[PDB]
Amino acid sequence: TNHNLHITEKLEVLAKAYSVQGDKWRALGYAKAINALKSFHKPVTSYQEACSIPGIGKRMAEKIIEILESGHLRKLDHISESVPVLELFSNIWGAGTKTAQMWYQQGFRSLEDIRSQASLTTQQAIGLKHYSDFLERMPREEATEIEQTVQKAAQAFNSGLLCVACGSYRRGKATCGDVDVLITHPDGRSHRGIFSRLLDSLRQEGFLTDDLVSQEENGQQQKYLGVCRLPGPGRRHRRLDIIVVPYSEFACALLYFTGSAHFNRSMRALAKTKGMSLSEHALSTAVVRNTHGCKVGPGRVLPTPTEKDVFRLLGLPYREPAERDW
DNA sequence: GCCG
DNA sequence: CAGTTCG
DNA sequence: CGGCCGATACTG
Ligand code: NA
Ligand code: NA
Ligand code: NA
C-alpha cells in the first residue's frame, strides 16, 4: 500500500528524533503527516497536492517537496548526535525521554555504561535484562499459546471466566509485540480479587519470569504487566499484559485493549467533540468540560453491551478489529 | 509538527 | 507529584 | 491562542 516510502522514511527519522528528545507534540504532528501519506494511493507530486491532504500543512508540504526534489532533507543532517543514544536508552522499558536525557547529560553513551554506572529502577533493570527480547515481535501463533496458557490457569479456578487476547492479535496481525489478555466474568462480580490466584497459578508453573507493574498488596488491582516464557527450547521472554474488568465495562475494555493506540485516540477525540467521553471504563454523554477541555463534569455512562453500541452511540459505522490500525 |  | 506506560 | 485521549493505572 505504501506509495510514498521515499518520503515517509526520511520523515519517520525526523519524527522519532523529536519524540526521543521530548518534543511530543511536534512528533505527534509528524506521526499524523506520515500516518496519512502512507494511507494515500498516489505518490504526492505537487506542493498543492500535499496541502490538500489532511494532516499535512504548508510546513510539512515544503519538507515533502525538498525530498521529491533534493532526494534529501537538510534538516536530517543537523539532527543532534545525541538522538541515537537517547533512542537506545529510551528503548529500555521503564525509561522515557526524561530518563534518557538525564543519563545522556550524565555522560552515558551505551547500555554498557547504563549497566555498570546508572541508577536503575526495578522496572528499568528488568527492561535492560530483556533489552533485545522487548524489541522483538512474536509470531501470532505463539501469542495464541500464551493466551491459552493464561486462560487455562484462569478457568482452572473459575470456568465462567472469559479470556480474550486483544491488541495486534485481535486486529489480525501476523506478529505481535506482546500479548494483551482481557479477563472478565459474565455474572458481574466473580472477577473480583482473582489476580492473586491467577498470578500465583502462573508463577507456580514458572510461566511468569518478571513483574513490571503489579499492585498486588491492594485487592483493587486492574492490570498486570510482566514477562513470561513458554516452556521448551528456543523460547524467548515475551511481554504479557493482563487486565481484569467488571462485565459492565467489557465492551469499552475490549475496544480499548484492541486498539490501535492511534485508533483509540482518534475515537476519543471524536467523542470529545460531541460532548461525550470514551475510556477503557465507559462511554459517557453530557460530560461537562472547562475552557481547556478538561473533564469537570462526569455526565452519565451510556449502556454499551457491545463494541457496536459504542460506534453507534458515536454515530460511526462499525469496524472489525482488522480495520482499526488507524 | 496540524488544526480549529 | 513527575514519569512512564497501556491500547 | 492552545489542544493534541484517558479525571489511563502504577511507581517512588
Ligand atoms: Na522506555
Ligand atoms: Na499489544
Ligand atoms: Na507490586
Side-chain angles (χ1 to χ4, degrees), chain A residues 4-5 7-15 17-37 39-43 45-47 49-57 59-67 69-73 75-188 190-191 193-293 295 297-325:
Chain A
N4 291 290
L5 182 63
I7 297 178
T8 69
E9 184 169 295
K10 291 192 178 71
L11 293 179
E12 298 178 300
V13 178
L14 196 48
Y18 287 128
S19 187
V20 294
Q21 301 174 97
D23 193 335
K24 62 175 301 182
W25 298 132
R26 179 177 299 285
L28 176 65
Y30 278 69
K32 297 194 171 185
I34 298 175
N35 196 297
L37 284 182
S39 297
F40 211 12
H41 63 70
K42 73 158 289 192
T45 56
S46 176
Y47 174 72
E49 191 187 312
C51 299
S52 63
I53 315 175
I56 303 183
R59 294 169 163 291
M60 199 57 75
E62 293 179 58
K63 299 182 193 297
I64 291 180
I65 292 303
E66 187 186 304
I67 293 182
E69 275 178 43
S70 300
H72 300 69
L73 184 58
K75 200 58 163 289
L76 289 180
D77 297 62
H78 284 296
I79 294 178
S80 179
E81 62 171 313
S82 65
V83 167
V85 177
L86 295 182
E87 190 169 319
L88 179 72
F89 292 171
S90 185
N91 282 333
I92 291 174
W93 201 97
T97 183
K98 295 298 180 178
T99 303
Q101 292 271 44
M102 178 187 78
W103 284 336
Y104 189 91
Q105 189 288 311
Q106 296 182 338
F108 299 158
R109 297 286 180 286
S110 77
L111 296 194
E112 176 44 41
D113 289 342
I114 299 301
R115 176 194 68 66
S116 65
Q117 301 170 59
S119 185
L120 301 179
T121 64
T122 302
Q123 304 178 332
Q124 304 169 333
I126 288 178
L128 181 54
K129 164 189 168 184
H130 301 295
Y131 193 86
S132 295
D133 284 336
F134 285 13
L135 289 173
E136 304 178 13
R137 301 181 65 71
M138 74 187 93
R140 64 174 297 121
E141 311 93 69
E142 184 179 2
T144 295
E145 302 177 71
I146 290 170
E147 183 285 306
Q148 286 292 78
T149 304
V150 180
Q151 174 183 163
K152 179 173 177 298
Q155 299 187 315
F157 59 71
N158 181 303
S159 58
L161 291 174
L162 182 54
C163 303
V164 187
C166 310
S168 58
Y169 181 85
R170 188 165 182 254
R171 298 205 303 284
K173 291 306 173 295
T175 64
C176 308
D178 60 24
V179 182
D180 305 300
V181 185
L182 171 47
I183 300 177
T184 188
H185 197 312
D187 65 49
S190 298
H191 65 291
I194 66 176
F195 266 112
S196 59
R197 290 171 290 178
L198 179 58
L199 298 183
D200 271 305
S201 181
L202 294 179
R203 292 198 178 91
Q204 176 186 54
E205 45 179 293
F207 181 62
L208 297 188
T209 68
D210 303 82
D211 305 322
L212 289 162
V213 176
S214 195
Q215 195 171 67
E216 297 165 61
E217 57 288 306
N218 188 296
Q220 296 309 83
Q221 174 167 37
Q222 300 185 55
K223 65 182 183 182
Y224 169 84
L225 303 197
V227 186
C228 66
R229 186 171 68 176
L230 293 170
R235 294 298 192 173
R236 310 304 306 174
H237 287 85
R238 304 300 187 187
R239 291 183 295 119
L240 171 61
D241 301 339
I242 298 171
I243 61 178
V244 175
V245 308
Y247 199 66
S248 67
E249 311 192 332
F250 184 48
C252 287
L254 181 65
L255 182 70
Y256 154 68
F257 226 22
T258 296
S260 71
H262 289 297
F263 171 80
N264 287 336
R265 293 174 78 164
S266 300
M267 183 161 270
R268 297 181 180 198
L270 173 54
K272 178 175 291 192
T273 64
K274 303 173 178 292
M276 301 165 78
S277 76
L278 176 66
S279 80
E280 37 264 55
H281 293 302
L283 174 70
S284 298
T285 178
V287 165
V288 184
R289 294 189 167 75
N290 62 51
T291 307
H292 301 59
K295 200 175 189 180
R300 39 201 163 76
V301 180
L302 290 169
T304 62
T306 67
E307 288 181 321
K308 286 178 176 177
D309 289 295
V310 175
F311 285 83
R312 181 176 60 68
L313 289 161
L314 289 169
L316 295 172
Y318 181 70
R319 289 192 172 181
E320 300 296 332
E323 286 305 300
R324 304 176 196 173
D325 293 307

